[PDB]
């Protein structure tokens, strides 16, 4: 499945995984444009610390309210809200403590269901949940491999991880180089 790691733009690394362009970069995810932006939050969908703070503050109070409304309704493994004032069509709020491969698989499936092309996510779990960056990287990329292997990638064309700490970026880079053709 794996293509070659290159750097298309300063500080960005990319490689193909099947038909998907997988990219990683460091920086502030709230500045990104994508069909879906992922928020890594708590099981109450109301964390406002680290990247979740930035996402909820930029997205706005209407998204905060959509989150607590759905959180009240049933036990969710993740929730989908509007994008608020972020540059996306939907935010998918996943639980940072949850199995990362499972969370990314869910995000990919939801994006196919909406015929979306682009996804931007953080290094899910490496914030408040304190999952280890190496395991998180392995899980994210494994989820994308499985999705491609199953023939499920149709609308999804671009998956970008925008990562708050350059040191975590370095871990993702190493993982891509491990996998490259
Ligand atoms: Br991150």
Curated annotation (Swiss-Prot):
Question: Which residues make up the binding site for a glycoprotein 3?
Answer: 28-29, 40, 51, 125-129, 164
All residue ranges annotated as the Macro domain in the record = 9-180
| Signal sequence annotation | none
Coiled coil (UniProt feature): none
The PTM entry states: Auto-ADP-ribosylated.
What does the entry say induces or represses the expression of this protein?
A: Up-regulated by IFNG in macrophages. Down-regulated by IL4 in macrophages.
Q: In which tissues is it expressed?
A: Expressed in macrophages.
UniProt superkingdom: Eukaryota
Location(s), subcellular: Nucleus; Cytoplasm
This protein's assembly is summarised as:
Interacts with STAT6. Interacts with PARP10. Interacts with PARP9 in IFNG-stimulated macrophages; the interaction prevents PARP14-mediated STAT1 and STAT6 ADP-riboslylation.
Role noted for this protein: ADP-ribosyltransferase that mediates mono-ADP-ribosylation of glutamate residues on target proteins. In contrast to PARP1 and PARP2, it is not able to mediate poly-ADP-ribosylation. Has been shown to catalyze the mono-ADP-ribosylation of STAT1 at 'Glu-657' and 'Glu-705', thus decreasing STAT1 phosphorylation which negatively regulates pro-inflammatory cytokine production in macrophages in response to IFNG stimulation.
Q: Which family does it belong to?
A: Belongs to the ARTD/PARP family.
Instruction: List the protein's name.
Output: Protein mono-ADP-ribosyltransferase PARP14
Q: What species was this sequence derived from?
A: Homo sapiens (Human)
Highest classification ranks of the organism:
Eukaryota, Metazoa, Chordata, Craniata, Vertebrata
